[PDB]
Amino acid sequence: DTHKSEIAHRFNDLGEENFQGLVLIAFSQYLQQCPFDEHVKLVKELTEFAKTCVADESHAGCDKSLHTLFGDELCKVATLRETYGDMADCCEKQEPERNECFLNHKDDSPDLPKLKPEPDTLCAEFKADEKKFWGKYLYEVARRHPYFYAPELLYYANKYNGVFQECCQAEDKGACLLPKIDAMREKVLASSARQRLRCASIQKFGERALKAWSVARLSQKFPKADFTDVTKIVTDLTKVHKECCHGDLLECADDRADLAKYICDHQDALSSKLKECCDKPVLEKSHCIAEVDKDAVPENLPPLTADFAEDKEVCKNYQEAKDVFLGSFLYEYSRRHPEYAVSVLLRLAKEYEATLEDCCAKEDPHACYATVFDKLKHLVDEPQNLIKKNCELFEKHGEYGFQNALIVRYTRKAPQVSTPTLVEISRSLGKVGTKCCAKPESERMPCTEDYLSLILNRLCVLHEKTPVSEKVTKCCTESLVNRRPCFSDLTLDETYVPKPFDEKFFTFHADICTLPDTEKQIKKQTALVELLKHKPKATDEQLKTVMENFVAFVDKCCAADDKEGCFVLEGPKLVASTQAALA
Ligand SMILES: C[C@H](CO)OC[C@@H](C)OC[C@H](C)OC[C@@H](C)O
Ligand SMILES: C[C@H](CO)OC[C@@H](C)OC[C@H](C)OC[C@@H](C)O
Ligand SMILES: C[C@H](CO)OC[C@@H](C)OC[C@H](C)OC[C@@H](C)O
């Protein structure tokens, strides 16, 4: 009834600016290939209707579900079948099947042109119309990242406004803007891959998967909070995420504000670090809570062995409520160990489960489970050795070299995967050395495992849409928690049948010389994957040889008088020599 006017409710809660930015973000994530101009028209239609409903909630159609009015507007796009083909058959369904149908067509890899920041243009547009400028930013990020966490995206537009405000008054605009745009881009991609994982985890493993993970993570952040408080916040947070992942962006933002306000209302029970956040306006306040540091572990917490090893009544407590007991173990263990990664803590709780499953059936269980922490130690040693061996590799070779060593590893593990994905994934895995290796001791394992989760999740998303490795299938779907170690344990796929040498990847036109350093690296790393797809067992000496000849060749032609001529006429020599080197 009254609150059947969901659209009026949302508009009242969020205010017009946020309402519109959220509706814009929604259209952009569902119809990633429509122009801004079109999306602005749809947002204005729905805002105008919301305003009619606010004035009068009994107006016709004002009682429809917000998500229904929104799906109806999507279906009312004339080019819908021309552009999105099958997507239009979504329209023939009732909700919530219609939406689940639309969501299915969200495109994780839409391959839209690269935005190349032209600072003077950016600044002319920003000066012309600040509000259109920000809209075009939301649209452009949102269409590229159809699962971006919508309220954070509103936040980024507000935050970076100060950028343009200061930078666009300067004469040397590009010196001011370009470093900041780079940093903006960094946060955005980080944020995107994080939200992508939250959505994949809900969709492929269930809401409970994301809850477990959140319980670990918040217990580290708010180690003084009570289990029941963590539980309340995680559930409310998981609803917010499920809503954003399902395209319910207004309800998602509305629920998040409520959560931010609840966390500020109760900060004394939660963390003293929250004081910084709580006098801020709503988007910054939520951002600031999402980013707050771990509070200090309180004094006087009993040793974990008191409740979970020494205690003679573990088996009783576990059999009486298996799930609460493990949840509680997870909370207790997480609060005391901010230095452990979330997934390591989840792996610890699973192994603990396994142990009690075995131990409680036994004659005398207490003797069996009392040494459980000795059993668990390997789950902490292995991530540690991973980090140790990889960080020395990274520092021995630097980022690009480290990327190249993972190119070799990953092509072997998953040779069926497409070369652009193996290059993209391997370059990100190597950047995990750049982001994590130099961090403090108590940050290295959380940082390493968290970025590995984000990048393997990106591999799983791409792969699940066009499956070509049974092994990558296995590691993606068998267990969210064991993804990283499942991937880590892969050896050369002995099932794989080598492809013939693909020469095009070792032959070039003159415009290779003109490429940015990154694109040049990508060309080389692409060649590298191709070497291995052809000869997965090539020796390091062969690979270095080929790649040294490759760089040598490009140098030589790029320095020629006739570049094209040297590439085309000499190019067959690199091909010939490369093959001779693989004999
Ligand atoms: C579609 C329409 C532009 O005409 O809305 C986009 C606009 C309201 O952006 C909202 C976003 C939160 O703005 C950024 C801040 C700094 O104004
Ligand atoms: C209001 C604001 C929403 O993003 O609060 C978030 C805060 C409670 O924690 C975010 C934290 C990093 O958990 C994310 C996990 C669930 O992947
Ligand atoms: C909210 C809930 C307990 O009430 O916490 C999640 C609980 C099932 O964690 C147990 C354990 C970590 O599960 C291992 C799986 C989810 O990876």
From Swiss-Prot:
The modification Phosphothreonine is found at residues 83, 419, 421, 545. Zn(2+) binds at residues 67, 246, 248. Residues 1-185, 186-378, 379-576 form the Albumin domain. Keywords: Calcium, Cleavage on pair of basic residues, Copper, Disulfide bond, Lipid-binding, Metal-binding, Methylation, Phosphoprotein, Repeat, Secreted, Signal, Zinc. The modification Phosphoserine is found at residues 5, 58, 65, 272, 418, 488. Ca(2+) 1 binds at residues 6, 243, 248, 251. Disulfide bonds join 53-62, 75-91, 90-101, 123-168, 167-176, 199-245, 244-252, 264-278, 277-288, 315-360, 359-368, 391-437, 436-447, 460-476, 475-486, 513-558, 557-566. The modification N6-methyllysine is found at residue 533. GO terms for cellular component: blood microparticle; cytoplasm. Interacts with FCGRT; this interaction regulates ALB homeostasis. Interacts with TASOR. In plasma, occurs in a covalently-linked complex with chromophore-bound alpha-1-microglobulin; this interaction does not prevent fatty acid binding to ALB. Belongs to the ALB/AFP/VDB family. This is Albumin. It comes from Ovis aries.
